[model samples]
Target: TITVSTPIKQIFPDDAFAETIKANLKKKSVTDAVTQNELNSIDQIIANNSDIKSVQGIQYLPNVRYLALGGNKLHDISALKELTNLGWLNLSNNQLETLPQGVFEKLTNLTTLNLSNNQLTSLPQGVFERLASLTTLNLSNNNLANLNDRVFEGLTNLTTLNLSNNNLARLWKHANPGGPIYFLKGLTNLTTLNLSNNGFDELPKEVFKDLTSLTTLNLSNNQLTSLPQGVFERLTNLTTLNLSNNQLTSLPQGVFERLTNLTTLNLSNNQLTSLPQGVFERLTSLTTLNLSNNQLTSLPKGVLERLTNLKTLNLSNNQITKEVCRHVAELLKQAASLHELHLSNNNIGEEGAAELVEALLHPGSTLETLDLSNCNLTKEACREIARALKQATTLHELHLSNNNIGEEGAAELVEALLHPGSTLETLDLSNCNLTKEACREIARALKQATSLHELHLSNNNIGS
Candidate 1:
């Protein structure tokens, strides 16, 4: 009998994965066998975008703390259960449709797990109950329709959860009341939640009552018609709230009373026809507000009066006319922090434009950008706005496209550009009824413009 004094070698079944491990270990070939003692010394393996199909050999590397196998052809990750010391694992951009049960039962030290951009239909129940230290989990861009009630029971330390781009219409169990409370229980440390593009028509009032630590929540691109009262009452610490691209007709009076710390709020692309008085009174910390693409014809007097810190406001693409512009003019006259205002795509006519020029020229106002494109403005309104532009020192960009401002109005605005110390840098005058004579006047006057850098004059009557 012949006795050998060599360690046993464990051969890998997947040649591609073996080659990756061999390349990381600096071995010569995939055919080379490695011993268990050699694999125990490896702590990290980064094999992303390697076209690896199977990870059968990963069982040997039990001491690995970080493993990256994203952008591969992996349909099964069953071998990762051996790596009990793993803290980070990325398997995104793969073809994983289903995961085997008990595959991640021992990975208690995991902190970050990314499975986004996969084809997972559903997650196994209690599959992540052992990962108590996980802080970030991304499951976006999947086809998940529903989850088990106790699926996320033990993920108490989860801070960021992204469930966007899924087919989930609701979170309740069998339309039972307060069923979402059990589905999202024990996740008190979550701070960011994204449920956008999920086809949700309505939200349960108490669905988010426990997520008091959330600061950023996005629910855009859904089928939500109306929000239930007290749905967002617990998110007092939220700084960003997006409810755009829905079918909401109205908002409750006190729906946003608790989101006092919100700095950015987007409510665009809805069917809202009116706003309740003092609806936004509590959002004093808001700096950016977008209420464009609605059916609002007017704003109440004290609706936006308390937003003194407001810097940017978008009310474009609505039915707001003279009355609404009056309210906005009031804000502009008193607001010292208003920097950008978009009121384009509305018929703010001659009187409405006149009402805004005084506030635009206010000494305390610092408005920089004003978009009034396609507002049915005539030569009369342009003449008044030109008078204010002649004295404007802070206005940099002005959009006036698709207006019927004739040669007289164009000449008036060109004279303002020639004014001393004019800071109007960008001016859009496309499709304005300017003849060849008007172009001659503007070209001659623009030579003396010191601060004008961008001038758009397309689609005008410059007859050759």
Candidate 2:
């Protein structure tokens, strides 16, 4: 019952709003819901879940632009604010709780809005202030504990904002507490902000002070333990940053010093036991570094040696010792462009294996890929990883799986892969129990190793 009377109340059915979107597009999906209209309107209606519970016969499609009544059975939609040429609206997993006041206030050419999952707890005050050219706003998995700053005041040309799995600490349990910089006050051209699993323990100090054109920021999982002092020192156009599964035990030294155009930094499963010295010194244009399952026992020295343009460094499952592999071999000796080094499940005991075999035979080691899998290394830690592979250069891939280095540590890494610039190409001594006298010194080092192709000695004691 649309009224359009000399300006307002009297416009009837636009053919029952295109026959209720062609009968919910014949159970909404392909009768033009085809691929979810996804975009570009086919006459004011996009019925995806077919069972669309009453859209008040969709106010006679007043030039309806785009609308997909998300997942089955939705209640009264107050006639989608007279659909004034709407831009995009996906009422996700629908069952919308309440949204009466002029809906999207006459859809002021609304840009994009996805009310995700839906059981929306609260949001009605000027509901998204006329969405002036809004960019993208997905109210992720709503139950939004409290969000009344008129729910994103103006949305000043919002870039992208996914209030992830909302509870927003039920208004910070401070009740509608304006902390996240006063509820993301007018997202400064927000680049991408997904407040992951909003259970934030506490966040106040300059809360993301004017999200300087954030590149990407997902404060993964929640309950942040600590992160305030100069928090992320002006996100210098941050490349990517996900403080994974938070409970962060620490991180507040020049807070990633100007993120030097950071590449990627995901501090995994936090409870960090160590890390402070020049904390990731200016992230020196880092390549990729994820401190896995944090509780790190140590890593002080140059705290990632200025991330030497690191190519990939994940200190997997932490409690790292072995003197943190001599600061990861002096941070891979300036990371001669680090190849790959994932120190699996840690506890580098045995006095941290001779300081990671003299820092990997020093001489500016050019390591390809090395994962000292399960640092419970035995057989005297495989003679210090086969004398750190009697180096020269291009030391290929070598993952010493599940330690206890039997067969005398695979006969000293198959006799250091037959020395001579041992370019070992893939050698994983799986469940290291290699018998037959270490497979006869690994057949005398694969007969000159000749760049040995692949040698994975699985479940050892070889056919005893």
Candidate 3:
């Protein structure tokens, strides 16, 4: 077999290297797949050019530390066995479908391997077996099919695995004959796993039981409606779980019972109207919760009562009314850590908004970022909130849009913003029936208000 080199010499070595690369085709251009050039006396051949269709004789760099053969047209990479000292290897965005058996197996010192954005259809068996010390593996944007514990056998130290934008629906379509195959076992050290933007309608029971050390799990933007009970019961160490943007109308009781360490849980952008009693009774460690863009009319009696650790709670864009405002107010009495409250577009009326005002008026409250826009608030509701603000010292970003709080109510709020120690930063009164007197009064308050940065006064009686 004639040898061919990309550094201006057509010489392929190791017999297989020359024959395989030469058999592929004649060198269309010398720089096609050449990453390293000038026939350097040391180092490795890079061949990162997109036009590179083949890489051969890289075995020459027996001690190269880092190799990036990404963004190339490489179809065969088995010849890479030439180099053995690589600690990081990136073959991303290539036209590779199958990697040689020697890749992860031979790179015993490799810590990072990125094979993302490729045309890979299947994961090589015993693929990660040799990568015992690997910490990061990014296989995102690939066309791979099937996943199980066998695929991740020896990656005990791996901490991050990105498999998003792939065909994982088939693996989770059914409780694969013998229960989901513990798809990710042994690799118990993984901390982050992203499976978003997939076609998963269901998940096998106890599917994630093996990911013990995982801290973040993102299953958002999927077609899941409800989870099997206790599905996430073993992810005790998970801190963030994203189940937003799904078709879920309800949840299986105790689904999140074991996720005791969760700090951020996003269940927004779904069709849920109610939650099972005692559902969130165990999430006592949650800090940020988003239940917006759903059909929730009332929270379970003790749902918000136990989230004393909550800092941000968004219950906006739902069917909540005054009937539940008393319970909401009571819930806030327990949320000593609450800083943000979003109840916009719930049409809580004067009574409901007034109930929340009472909660915010608590002497020791740290309430801030209250968004009650489109709550059907009126002059009476605005007056109560104004009085609360007058006595409040921590409130900021008050949104009261699309209401008719009138001139007197607006004047009352303006007077409060002018009060000493008010931390109000943003005030929204769009279409609140504000008149010239209200605007003139607000002008007077603005001159004295030092912390206010944003104010919305659109579409009101102050037109003239």
Candidate 4:
């Protein structure tokens, strides 16, 4: 077994030294190898002996630096006390519930520890106190419900912590008047934290006052209803924020105004109906925004116009109407950085879809992806879309799914798709009232079209 402290370079410095060692080992190699093999065989035999009911634990090799006993039935790690040089350890998918106190006192140099996907309910107090040199610690996908205060007190040098997909209900609880303040109160130097897929309802006041260095925070898939005012005032350096799949009704005014460095903000799958005016004016650096699957009926006027740096905008599965499209169009005229816009599953009628297409075809529009699926469009609207397509030179993906456009409308859309000036790459007309004649027109268009890649016509009751 190779010891953890045995550096490979020091063990075999040169080829000549390796050859000399091999030549000397050949004489006693059989006896040495046989004895080692017999020892391993005996150990395995002892481990399998049913009569030895409680073996306490197994310490096969104390000097082994990197140990991977993952996916095993080994529960007790007390036997690993002598492996002081261990720097990397993987005890994932194990039956261990907790690490013994002082378990890592001797492993001072340990930097990376993986205890993910385990049955650990809580980490022992001061379990990581001696792991001051630890950098990355992953306790994700575990059953840990709570962590002792100062559980990470001694880990001032630690950087990345993965506590995601766990059963943690709170960070730290204080019994002074309200409750424990939890672990979030003490992480002064933490930069990245993953609290996603948990049961958090609200972020306590001053929850992140000490974590001024945090740049990325993932609170997605939680029960967060609203954020406190100035909740992110301390997080001036935060760049990427994921608040998707929550119960947020509205964003606190100036919530993101101070986060001038924010780039990607995901508020998708929430209950937000509208955004405050100039809510994102300070986030001039924002690039991607996801507002899909919400109760939004309209976007604040000039909102997109203010996001001059926005590249991808997802407003799908909302209650946006034709007027919303006009508003969006007016803003798109100002957004020079916008490339992809998703308006799928809205109440945008043919008039609305046509208006959007017109906006994209505008001289100043930089749109590339336009999705208007299930917009209740008609034949007249298809004609309008065709007309707009004649002017659009940047459109690459167009989704028109589940519209009322009949044979003539579908034919008109196909004709526009076949146009040489059209840059459409993917066309989706699935569940649209298309007929056999419409299919013929589309097939003809495909023969002439060279940029079209994917055509979604499924679920449509087209006549044979």
TM-score of each: 0.93, 0.34, 0.86, 0.84
Candidate 1's C-alpha lDDT? 0.83
lDDT string, candidate 4, 1-464, tens digits:
43333322234333332232233334332212222232222211111111211112224333456655556555667766766767787777666777777888888878888888878887767788888788788888888876765677777766678887887656532333446445666666677878887777767657667777777888898888888787677887888899998899978778777788889999999999988887888888899999999999866666666778889989999998677788778777887668888888888886787777667668888888888788778888888889867668787888888888777888887778778788778888887887666666676667667788778776665566
Compared with the true structure, all predictions reach lDDT values of 0.83, 0.73, 0.77, 0.72
* Candidate order, lDDT descending: 1, 3, 2, 4
lDDT of 1 by residue, 276-354 (tens): 9878999999999999898989778879998988999999999886877878878978878888999889888898898
Residue 283 accuracy (lDDT) in model 3: 89
Please give me the total number of clashing residue pairs in predicted model 3.
13
Off by more than 4 A, model 1: 1-10, 172-182, 440-444
Candidate scoring better on lDDT of 2 and 3? 3
TM-score winner: 1
Model 1 error, position 45 (Å): 2.5
Off by over 4 Å in 4: 1-62, 170-178
What is the per-residue lDDT of model 3 for residues 177-202, given as tens digits with 9 covering 90 to 100? 65555667676898999988767788
Q: Determine the C-alpha RMSD for candidate 1 after optimal superposition of all C-alphas.
A: 2.9
Per-candidate clashes, comma-separated = 0, 8, 13, 12
- Leading candidate by lDDT: 1
lDDT of 2: 0.73
Name the better of 1 and 3 by TM-score: 1
Give RMSD to native, each candidate: 2.9, 16.2, 5.2, 7.4
Error of 2 at 164 (Å): 17
